[PDB]
């Protein structure tokens, strides 16, 4: 739901107080993407 | 460099696009006094 997926564009087209909300969306989403991958790899590891 | 400007109840609007608004070479050509900018400073118009 951020203005872009390109973090360099959020950092170019906004600044500090307005930017850091639009970046914290990408922190939340990316982190969810990693934690989903690691949870699937733990479950495959238990199968292998 | 127009021959005359418009009657202000029926002012003249032109759309400026697909071009470089190089400020110094045209604003040095005709003498003028006021450069009252709002929201952006005069010097930063060179690379914004």
């Amino acid at each position: 739901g951020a203005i872009s997926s390109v973090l360099n564009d959020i950092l170019s087209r906004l600044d500090k107080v307005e930017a850091e909300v639009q970046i914290d969306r990408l922190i939340t989403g990316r982190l969810q993407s990693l934690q989903t991958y690691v949870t699937q790899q733990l479950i495959r590891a238990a199968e292998i | 460099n127009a021959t005359r400007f418009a009657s202000v109840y029926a002012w003249n609007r032109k759309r400026i696009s697909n071009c470089v608004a190089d400020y110094s070479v045209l604003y040095n050509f005709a003498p003028f006094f006021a450069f009252k900018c709002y929201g952006v400073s005069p010097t930063k118009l060179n690379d914004l």
Partner: protein, 48 residues
């Protein structure tokens, strides 16, 4: 309670009060009195 308290006091044009907020843009907040983008405190203003 407060561990230290520091009253800053100065005069501006009522047009400038919106720039005394953290991280904004405009000549007072750019060249005269710039507070932290993360400051803790209160901004107070009135006409005189």
């Amino acid at each position: 309670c407060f561990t230290n308290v520091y009253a800053d006091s100065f005069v501006i044009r009522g047009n400038e009060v919106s720039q005394i907020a953290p991280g904004q843009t405009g000549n007072i907040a750019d060249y005269n009195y710039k507070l932290p983008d993360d400051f803790t405190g209160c901004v107070i203003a009135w006409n005189s």
